[PDB]
């Protein structure tokens, strides 16, 4: 169901890596490991537990990147004076998703820093 050294779960393959990369590079590295592979995504098919309990014991178990960069968008913010939101000065590097094993929950952090990663691709 998966290639050697990749765990199986609900039709998805998961592999852990001990490298330290910024969000962007992590995603790229993942896409390179196998077709349709990306930074792990969580929808709670109880992947969390699995990913952290099985697809993690093979890892430093900390802080792994999550494949979600919730960058501020025009879709949900606007000026009270109805002026268009062209120029923006909000931080874009802030908001890369992350899973903190010690807090057993996600967190938003600078996309520019480094973290371990778990790639994932549907079989």
């Amino acid at each position: 169901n998966c290639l050697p050294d990749w765990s199986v779960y609900e039709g998805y393959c998961y592999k852990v890596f001990k490298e330290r990369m910024n969000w962007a590079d992590a995603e790229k590295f993942c896409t390179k490991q196998h077709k349709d592979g990306h930074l792990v995504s969580f929808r709670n098919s109880k992947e969390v537990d699995f990913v952290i309990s099985l697809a993690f014991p093979m890892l430093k178990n900390d802080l792994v990147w999550i494949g979600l960069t919730d960058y501020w968008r025009d879709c949900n913010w606007e000026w009270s004076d109805g002026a268009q939101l062209d120029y923006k000065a909000w931080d874009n590097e802030r908001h890369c998703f992350i899973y903190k094993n010690t807090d057993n929950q996600w967190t938003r952090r600078d996309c520019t820093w480094t973290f371990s990663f778990v790639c994932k691709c549907p079989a």
């Binding site: 990306h38 929808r43 979600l68 879709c75 913010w77 606007e78 009270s80 004076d81 120029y87 929950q105």
Partner: protein, 131 residues
């Protein structure tokens, strides 16, 4: 041609008020000073610059200043996407909701930071003389 105490830029009048208020109340306050006054909107690096400096000179220190960047509360229409699927199952310590943005003294008031609307912070009003 702006009122006394107010400053001009791009044919717009601006004033920083050293009176801590909620996003809502400050916004309301600005709409009472002149037809169509509002919390300041920032449309260019040049303007962003004209505002921080007006903040820097007229407001006795504070960490944040209210601008009129408000959340549209359209989340269900602005669903984020994972590098593939949809962002539904989420798990963060989303304390209280922060549907407001203000200017931070940390970055000399040039950058924006998501903050709780209910917080009381000084503010900057703005309005066009031509109504």
């Amino acid at each position: 041609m702006c009122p006394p105490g107010w400053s001009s830029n791009g044919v717009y009048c601006y004033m920083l008020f050293k009176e801590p208020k909620t996003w809502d109340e400050a916004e309301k306050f600005c709409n009472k000073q002149g037809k169509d006054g509002h919390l300041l909107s920032i449309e260019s690096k040049k303007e962003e610059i004209l505002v921080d400096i007006v903040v820097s000179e007229n407001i006795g220190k504070m960490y944040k200043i209210w601008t009129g960047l408000s959340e549209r509360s359209k989340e269900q229409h602005c669903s984020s996407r994972w590098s593939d699927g949809s962002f539904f199952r989420s798990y963060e310590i989303a304390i209280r909701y922060s549907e407001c943005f203000v200017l931070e003294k940390q970055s000399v008031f040039r950058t924006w930071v998501a903050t709780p609307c209910e917080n009381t912070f000084p503010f900057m009003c703005k309005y066009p003389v031509p109504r």
